[PDB]
Every structure is written in C-alpha cells, then in structure tokens.
A paper describes a structure:
An initial preliminary structure of PdGH110B was determined by single-wavelength anomalous dispersion using a cadmium derivative. This initial model was used to solve the structure of PdGH110B in complex with a d-galactose monosaccharide to 2.35 Å resolution. The crystal structure of PdGH110B in complex with d-galactose revealed two chains in the asymmetric unit. Residues 25–238/241–616 for one molecule and residues 21–182/186–238/241–616 for the second molecule were modeled, with the missing residues residing in loop regions. The noncrystallographic dimer shows no evidence of being stable; however, each monomer in the asymmetric unit forms a crystallographic dimer. The crystallographic dimers have a total molecular interface, determined by PISA (Proteins, Interfaces, Structures and Assemblies) analysis, of 2300 Å2, predicting a stable dimeric state. The expected molecular mass of the PdGH110B monomer is 67.9 kDa, resulting in an expected molecular mass of 135 kDa for a dimer. This indicates that PdGH110B adopts a dimeric quaternary structure, which is most likely the biologically relevant assembly. The α-helix of domain II from the adjacent monomer folds over and along the wall of the active site, which was identified by a bound d-galactose, with several amino acid side chains protruding into the cleft that contains the active site pocket. The bound d-galactose monosaccharide was identified by clear electron density found in the central region of the β-helix domain of both active sites of the dimer. The modeled monosaccharide occupied a pocket that sequesters the monosaccharide in a fashion that is typical for glycoside hydrolases that are exo-acting on the nonreducing end of glycans.
Here we focus on a GH110 enzyme (PdGH110B) from the carrageenolytic marine bacterium Pseudoalteromonas distincta U2A. A campaign to identify enzymes that could hydrolyze terminal α-1,3–linked N-acetyl d-galactosamine and/or d-galactose from the A and B antigens, respectively, and thereby provide a set of biocatalytic tools to perform this antigen switching revealed a set of enzymes with specific B antigen exo-α-1,3-galactosidase activity. These enzymes were the founding members of GH110 (glycoside hydrolase 110) family, of which all currently characterized members are exo-α-1,3-galactosidases that are able to hydrolyze the B antigen glycan (Galα1–3(Fucα1–2)Gal-R). Overall, the results are consistent with PdGH110B representing the founding member of a GH110 subfamily that exo-hydrolytically processes terminal α-linked galactose residues in λ-carrageenan while providing general insight into the specificity of the family as a whole. The overall fold of PdGH110B is that of a right-handed parallel β-helix of 11 complete turns.
Numbering used by the authors:
A (entry chain A), B (entry chain A): 24 to 238, 241 to 616
Amino acid sequence: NDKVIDVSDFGAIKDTGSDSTHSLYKALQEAKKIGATKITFPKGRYDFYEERAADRLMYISNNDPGIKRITFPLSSFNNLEIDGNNSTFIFHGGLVPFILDESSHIVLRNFSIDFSRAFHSEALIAGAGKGYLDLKFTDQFPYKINEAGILKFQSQLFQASGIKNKDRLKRKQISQDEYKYEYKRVLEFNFALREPEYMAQDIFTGNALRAEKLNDVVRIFHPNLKAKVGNILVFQAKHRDYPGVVISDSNNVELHNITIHHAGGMGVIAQRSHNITIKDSKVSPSKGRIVSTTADATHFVNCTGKIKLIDNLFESQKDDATNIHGVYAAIDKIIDDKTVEIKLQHPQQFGFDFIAPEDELELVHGASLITYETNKVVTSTRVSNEVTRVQFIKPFDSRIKEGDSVSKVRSYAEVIIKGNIIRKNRARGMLLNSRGKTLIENNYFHTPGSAILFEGDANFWFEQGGVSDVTIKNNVFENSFYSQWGKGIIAVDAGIDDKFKETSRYNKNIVIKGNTFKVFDKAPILNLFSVSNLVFENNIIEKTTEYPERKKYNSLFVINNSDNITISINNILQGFSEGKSQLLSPTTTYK
Amino acid sequence: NDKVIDVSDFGAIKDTGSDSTHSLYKALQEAKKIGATKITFPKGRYDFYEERAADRLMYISNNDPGIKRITFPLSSFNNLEIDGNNSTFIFHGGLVPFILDESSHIVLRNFSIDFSRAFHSEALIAGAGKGYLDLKFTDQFPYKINEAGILKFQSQLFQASGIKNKDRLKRKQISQDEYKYEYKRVLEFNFALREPEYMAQDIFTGNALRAEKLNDVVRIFHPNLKAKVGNILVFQAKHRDYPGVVISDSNNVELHNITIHHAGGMGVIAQRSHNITIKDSKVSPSKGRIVSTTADATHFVNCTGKIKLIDNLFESQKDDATNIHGVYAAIDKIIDDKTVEIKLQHPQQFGFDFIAPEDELELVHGASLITYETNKVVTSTRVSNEVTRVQFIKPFDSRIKEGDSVSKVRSYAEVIIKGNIIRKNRARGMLLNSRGKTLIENNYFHTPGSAILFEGDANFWFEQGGVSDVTIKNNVFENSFYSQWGKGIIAVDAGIDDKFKETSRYNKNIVIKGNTFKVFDKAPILNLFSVSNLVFENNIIEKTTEYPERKKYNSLFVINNSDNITISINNILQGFSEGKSQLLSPTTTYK
Ligand SMILES: OC[C@H]1O[C@@H](O)[C@H](O)[C@@H](O)[C@H]1O
Ligand SMILES: OC[C@H]1O[C@@H](O)[C@H](O)[C@@H](O)[C@H]1O
Ligand SMILES: OC[C@H]1O[C@H](O)[C@H](O)[C@@H](O)[C@H]1O
Ligand SMILES: OC[C@H]1O[C@H](O)[C@H](O)[C@@H](O)[C@H]1O
Ligand SMILES: [Cl-]
Ligand SMILES: [Cl-]
Ligand code: NI
Ligand code: NI
C-alpha cells in the first residue's frame, strides 16, 4: 500500500540472521517519498550489522559523542509509525538502534532491542581472597588475557575462516572492537535478589585489570576487590557510545510496548524535544544477564510539553530510571557589559547547542543556584562544541562573575510518571529536576540509592533542576535506599554550598501523600535542605527486617534550611520500637 | 591591508602562552570575506588549545576518523598564503593543526608545529632482566601507575587549583585525556645513533603494561621485553587521531620551510588532491625527543598532478618517509551482471569516497593484482562509510569474483622526490606505489627497513601500486635496511600470491643508475619479483662494517618471476672478498 509499507517487500526476511539494515533503509526512504504512515515487520527476529548502516556525527547529551552508525536513521520523518509486531531486533557491534532527529509524530510499537554481545560483562564469583577474585564467565562474555596479563573483553571469539587472508583482517577487526567492551569499575550483585549486593560499593578498577587463567576460572587482581562468593560481579562499561533510542530536536514521539534489553549507555535519551510518551514498555535484561542498559533507563534534557512514563517496567540498569532536567552552561569569559562566552562544562554535554536570539536565559549564581535575573539573547555565536558567545539586550546584572552559569528559560516539561515498577537498578530511582508541573503517582520503588532525588548543580554535572510543583502520591517505596551511597529515600542533593543553604530555596511546593514506605531501618524518609513549602501527610510507614539495620541512622526526617515543612501528625507508623512523637520529629543530623 | 592580514590585529599576541585560536579564526574569516591573499604572524610563539577550536567530522585516509578539533580549518579557501615568519606553533591536546578541505592555491610558509605533550612516550632504559625493563622518564612524559598496577600516560600532571571544585572537573578532564596517550608496542632505540637499535624488533604490548615504581625508576613487566641498558625505549602511540597537515579534495598546495616536530599520526596526509609541493621543510623531533611524528612523515592517497618533495629532511618518524598510492576497494557483493557493492576493507580507509559516475575503474583479480578490464561507472550510491553500490555501463568481465577489487583510473601523480635526507625513522624510506612518471634523484637514505619498497596489495592494506616509469638516479643509500624486517635495500613486496608471480608483471620500466650503495653485509640490494624491464647500471657499491654482518644473506641481487632484468657489468663493487662475477650474479634465494 501507499499507506502501510511491509519491510519484507524490500528484502528484509525474518529469522535468518542476515543483515536487514539496507532493506530497512530503502523501505524508510519509500515511506518518506510517498507519505506512508506506517512500516510493519512480519513477526520474527531481525539482525542488523555495522557494514551498511548510515553514518552521522552526533552530539547526544549525557552520552558520548562521535560518528554513529544508525540502524533506524529517522531524520526529518513525520507521521510515521514503526510496528514490529513483537519482532525481536538484534544489533551486532557498535550501532545506535534509533536516532530521531528533527522528526515529528513518530510512533515506535511492539518490538525488542538487544545487542548480540553486551557492552558490559558479568561473571560468577567462585572465589575471593585478599586482593583478588576468582571468576567464571559464560560464553556470552568472551574475553582474552593477553601476554601482558591484562583481561580484555572481546566482541566475539575468533573463529578461523579457512581462507588465511580473511583471517588476518577479521583479527584486526575483532582487535579494534576491544574499545567498545572496555570496563571502568566492578560492582557485586546479590545472586538471589538480582540487585546490587546490600552495602556493596562501586570498586574503581580502570580499564585494565591484571588477570590469570588458573591452570575454566579467571583470577583478577586489584587491592580493593572484595565480594561474597556466589554473587555476580558486573564490569561496568566505560563508554556510552550506543544508546537505544535517541530523540533529538523532535516532537510528539510515543513508545508503546518497546522492550529495551540493552544499550551502550542509556535506553532512551531525549534532548531538546517536545511531548514524549513511553507506555507499557520494559527496560529489563535478556537471558543470562543481570544488567539491562549500561546507563540510565530514560533521560530527558531541555524537553518541553508533556513527558509521560506510564505503566512501564524499568529494572536492572546501571543508573537512574529517569532524570528530567535542563542544562547550565558556565560563564567562562565576560566580554563587555552585555556579552559573555558560555562554555559547556561536562564532556558529555559538549556539542549541546541551545542558546539562540530571542531566548530568555536565567543568570544564576553558581554556589547558591539563586537566579540574579533573566535576560534576553540578541546574539548567539557558536565558536566550538564547547564555547558560545552570547550578547544580551541589556547589560547583565553587575553581580555576575565568571564561574556563574546560565540556563534557558523554557516551557518546562509537564511530568506524569504513573504505574511504573522501578527496581534492581544500581543507582537512584528518579531525579526530579523538573521545574514544570510534576506528578509521581502509583509507582513501585525498590532502589539501592534514593528512590527520588532532587539534584541539579552548577559545579560538576551542570544540570538545571529546582522544582516548583510536585505531587508524589499513592506510591509504594519498598526497602528503597538500602545502599551506602545516598542521603535518604526521598532526598535533596542540589549543589548548594553550606553557606548559601539558608538563603537559597531551589525546590518549592511539594506534596507527599498517600504513599506507603516499607523501611528496614531508620534512614531518612525525607532528607531536605533549601526547600520551601512541603507537606508530608496521610502516609503509611511500616517497619521491616529486609536488610540489616544501619546503626548510622536514627531519624526518618532530616530537615535543614527550609521553611513551611509540615510533617503531619496524621501519618501512620507501625512496627517501630520508638514513640510516634519521636519518629515524626525532624532532626538536623542523621543522629 | 585588504591584501595582507596580520593576526595580531585580531588579538593574537605572541610569546604569552594564551590561546590564539579564536583570534586566528576571525582573521581567517576576514581574509576570506575581503579576498586577502596572505595572513602573517609576527615572529614568536603561539599556543592553541581545544576549547575554542572548530569541530568537524573528518575521514582521513590511513589515519583515524572522528570528530576533529581544527586550529586552521581551511575549508574552501583560495589563493591564501599563511606566513609564520618562523614563529613556533604549540598545540595543546587533541588538535589537528591544519585541515585543507576543498581549498585551492594554499601556501604554508615559515613555521613549526609541535604538541606540548607528545602522543608517544620515551624512557631511558636503566635496567633489564627476564620479563621486565627498568625505565626513567623525564618530565616531558607524565604518567601514573593506578591501583590496578597499570602504567598510563597522562596529558599533564594534575596541579591543584585552590578552588576545590575546579579541581574535580580538571581531574575528570585529565582522566579522559588518557585515551590520547595510549600505547600499543615498544621499540628499543640506539642511544648514540638516535635510531632503532640494530636488529631490534617491535615488541607488542597492548595498551596496558603492568608496572611498579621501585621504592624515581619505573619497572614494567612483559614476557617479551628485551633491550640493552642505556638505550631509549619508545612507546608507540596507539592512535592516529591528530595528523599535522591534512590536504583533502584540494589542489595546488605548497609547504615551504615548515617544521613538523610531532603529530598524532602522520605529519602530512594528502587524499584526492592535485599538485602538492613540500620544499625545504623538516620532519624532525623537538628537544628531549628521539621520535618525530608517530606515523609516516608524508603520505598521498589518490592524488593527481605533480607531487614534489624537494630538499626536505624527514627523520625519526615511526613509519615511512613517503608513500604515494591509490585505493583498492573489494567487490563485496555481486548484484547483477552490471552491478556490485564495493566495501572499504581497512578501518583507516572507511569513509574514503572516490567512485562517481563517468569514472573509469580497474577490475582487478585479488591474488594476482592483474587487471581483468576497465569499465565505466554510471551509478554510484554510497550506502555507508564502508559500502558503495556501483553500476557499470556494460556487464563486467565474467571472471570477476566477490573478493576481487576495484581501483579508480586516475591521472596518476607525477612524482619528483629530490634532495631529501631520509634517516633515523623506524620503517621504510619510500613506498613507491606511484603508477605515474616517478623520479627519485639525489636523496640520502639511512633506513632500518627497505629504503625503497614497491608494495601494494588487495588483501590487507588494499593499496593500489604498480609502477610504470621510475628513475632512481644519483642517490646515496648508506647502510640502509639494517633491521630484521624487510626483503632488501630496494625491494618488491606486492601482494601477489606465489602461484601468480610468474604471470603478473605489476611493476614495469625501472632505471636504477648512478647511485652509491654503502652496504655492511650481503643482504639484497635488489629483491625483485613480478617486474618487467629493469636496468641496474653505473652504480657504485661499497662494502662497510657499520653493523655486524647478518649470516642469513649472501646475495646482493635476488630475482624471481621477472623479465628483462639487466644487472650490468658496468657496476663497480669494491671492498668485498668475493669475485665481481659472483657478486653481480642474481639468485632466487637469500642463500
Ligand atoms: O554480601 C557480603 C559481602 O558484601 C560485600 O559488601 C563485602 O565487601 C564482602 O566482604 C562480603 O562481606
Ligand atoms: O643492542 C643490544 C640489545 O639488542 C636487542 O635487540 C636485544 O634484544 C637485547 O638483548 C640486547 O642484546
Ligand atoms: O547526577 C546526574 C547524573 O546521573 C546519572 O549518573 C546519569 O547517568 C548522568 O548522565 C548524570 O545525569
Ligand atoms: O604498508 C603500507 C602501510 O605503511 C605504513 O605503515 C602506513 O603507516 C600505513 O598507513 C600503510 O600505508
Ligand atoms: Cl547571591
Ligand atoms: Cl587471472
Ligand atoms: Ni524540564
Ligand atoms: Ni598516484
């Protein structure tokens, strides 16, 4: 039809293991040429390789920039639905499955994304001693130990060809693939619960560990290795070069019933885009794996309109389930009374262009995150993937210094996050850096880090946060924040120096009602600073014994430098040995 | 003036160490806007950094592709001379100094190029034992040994700031710079002669060596380490990301009195360009260094017109002094009787586009390098940075198989290489893969590898060679080919399988006259196969004792599968103990 295009008409045949990339490409161009509104896959398994994938330079915020090979290069597509009919997609090597670029009204529906060799690696811990672990790898994680004695994971094990010359080039190719499987650090996971081991920490290794094949078993050596035998050691991928679904300068995108088993980086990363829905989808590992995506499950940078995460499962990724936030760029040079040069600060922010004439920017004091003023841009001149020269309509506030920051005033995204399951990932649940109206309703949280974190800073990540209207209602937080890294189940960790906490009110107007908190010890349920107007009422708090109690904590409510904080008497806490009046009484310390 | 632009008028001030990149940029744009023909630097030292350099995707043949930061982004410039007045240019970090792209009539004159921290590293060998070397590094080569026990070179040593937060970002930045200084292998250099140690070999390490700080001295561990104490160990840079001068799709470019002290990769790399002169220039290390560029000094891919290398010094680079050659692309898929898909084979060839309609291509048998036919292109469709679909005007020769190759029929460059000094580099002198008229006159060669190599192959490098008109006259070859890797002083090593050597005549019409060969043993002066019509006459051959004699060789002239080879009786050989009649008598073996 000129309305519905079947990829098989273009040569893509399921269930054979052959490369479907070019057939898919021609089907895409025909859909655009005639204006078809849907591309369908006959249900089956489709494999995509590097050799015939479109190449484009990409800057992708909070991931690694470079030349990308892209299986679905959805540049300037409009009103196009891709229905996989529950096909499974397998990506071989360094591929970005989807990049939506200047596209509009795109629907992705009914398929799964996976890579044939994960970018992270995993092993069974078979033994442990001072300065070493003994590991067992499955076939799924090929590796070599070279003559230098260094463990190096591989894209695949070299199978000889017959033709001697095809072998020399294939070895060189496998050898250059090593970069993609570089590791950075290791983390112990509980075998039975399939989550980071209780009170285990990241152990920084670098990308080279000393190793020996005992002579089936691999011993790795590092002074700081420690782990329980029988658990699973995860090698964290060093790079974020292959995110799953990139949504960039696009609008009205919907993901329905998408399963992202794996990504080199984040599963879904959206930048400078408007209206995004992710519904009935899954971030969850494929067979034999305890880890899903090697970074965040979802992530939104300078997005507008409505961001909806509805009835999804987000489990087992190496970072947060979501983060919705803006970009700060530091004021690097003051040119004249009207003109500055801003510089993107974090490496995975380089190439993020966002300042244009007529834009309004916040001018922000760095150590306090307090806004001096807003000012309109009349000139924006991109000098590099770091520096942009900005001239304002009027001279900027005379208190502004080099080292302060700007962020664009936006129609901040309205956030609706409901019905999701968030568990077994490594870090936090949700970073709520959304200044727009935010609703967190009917989610389940079981996270090692904070289930919900208000962050943002203008000194390292350079991420704009600061909420103005948040409702967290009818959620279950079950034994969340069980790790050693974090400040509470629901916490503020904005980059506000101690000396400015008393005057900065970065997060405002938060309602926390009707939730159930199942907690195993007395770590903070709320750990707040620089908040104005928060009401915590009609919650149920219920003591458990899921994990050993951490003696470091003896306060459910840590409040500093805030105003209008109501920890209502109408909350219910049962199963604690202390009195209700003590348990609801805020402290300034963990105590 | 509107004719001559002084960079200092645009804010570039010598001898201060500040970044001159943006001032230079505005001077470049003004020169293009008004049509000025020259930009001058007041003599001094100018430093260029990453932060404000223009970023562009680049595919650069025989080097590494990616996003490049470019100090002199000479895109679409015409009739422009850059005169440095013997200024010195210092490049900090990952910068490509010059990229000439679609430019015309460009003159670069009177300056030097260097990087503040070399991409390779060097050390004094202070001790040696089984499976280890003991090294001493100077300040110029900063490094860390991390807790894993791995030696990792650094862009710089971290100097604390005062402000604690500027320190955290700077550490992250220094940490991400580590990739640029990765090593691959080590090679021992003779301290006194400043050249690869006699009969030393590359020792493959990989990018991670075990190491210990003895407690000023660094011990590295690897089973295959062996070296003489007092020599200098060079760590070969793993990447070729920052070549010195890129000349791409450009014409009529001249380099006069340019000193390239260092490059991350090749000093000068030219691709698909027409008429290039390099005169009175130097590739030669800066103070404290024994290595110059980390790959070839110069290199020309699919160039046309005249290539002139006149009165230059090319010393101490890690590869060849020059290589002038074409590209083969393998026939990966046969589509129909008229249509194939070609695929670039070597990773550093990806993104090399060269086939367009109306082009004539050679269709070549892979194992023999014999041309089946030429055929004209009517359709070229780039699928990726690897694959292009090519359709011919007529059905191609029915003997063609997948695995054969194509190369474009070109106005092959006329090559004039005269008055150059070639010495102390690691590999060969000149790879003469130039099918156009070639003149090698009045050069001095002192190379560890072959001084002059006819190479090319369609199985690994995929480089088109095959000479048709070569004159090698009045050169001095002094103790060249003193290493264990090579086949002779002047040798053929084309990728022609043994079974086709008898029928393939890939190199034709070579005159070798009036040269002086000073040789220390009886390795081949000529080692030829698949040559037709070569005359070796009026040469002087003179025995020396510069290096120990290699007992493996007892033949100055090894000839196989050739025709019309004249080793004239009018050559002079003095200082040998064998008879003249034996010494000029060809063999089929080293004997
Ligand atoms: O799960 C138990 C294990 O937990 C880790 O955090 C600890 O470092 C190991 O020594 C072992 O105690
Ligand atoms: O230069 C002398 C040295 O040369 C190297 O090629 C050899 O491996 C060392 O053991 C030492 O003999
Ligand atoms: O703390 C913010 C931080 O959170 C996660 O780690 C993300 O992966 C990062 O990109 C960054 O957004
Ligand atoms: O043998 C050919 C080979 O020669 C040198 O090593 C060059 O650095 C390579 O790019 C390649 O051209
Ligand atoms: Cl202030
Ligand atoms: Cl043949
Ligand atoms: Ni937002
Ligand atoms: Ni040529």
